[PDB]
């Protein structure tokens, strides 16, 4: 949740 809101590694939200 601390990058680009990407649902791959947990970057989502």
> CA–CA separation, 13 vs 9, rounded Å?
11
Sign of CA dihedral 2, 5, 11, 13: positive
Q: Which tokens in the block code for residue 10?
A: 């947990």
Who contacts 2 (Cβ-Cβ below 8 Å, separation ≥6)? 11
Distance CA 9, CA 2 (A): 11
Element (H, E) at 10: none
From residue 3, how far is each of 11, 12 by CA, in Å? 6, 8
Q: Looking at residue 11, what DSSP letter applies?
A: -
**Contact call for residues 13 and 1 (beta carbons, < 8 A):** yes
Phi and psi angles of residue 7, each rounded to the nearest 5 degrees, phi first = -85, 70
């Amino acid at each position: 949740f601390v990058q680009w809101f990407s649902k791959f590694l947990g970057r989502i939200l």
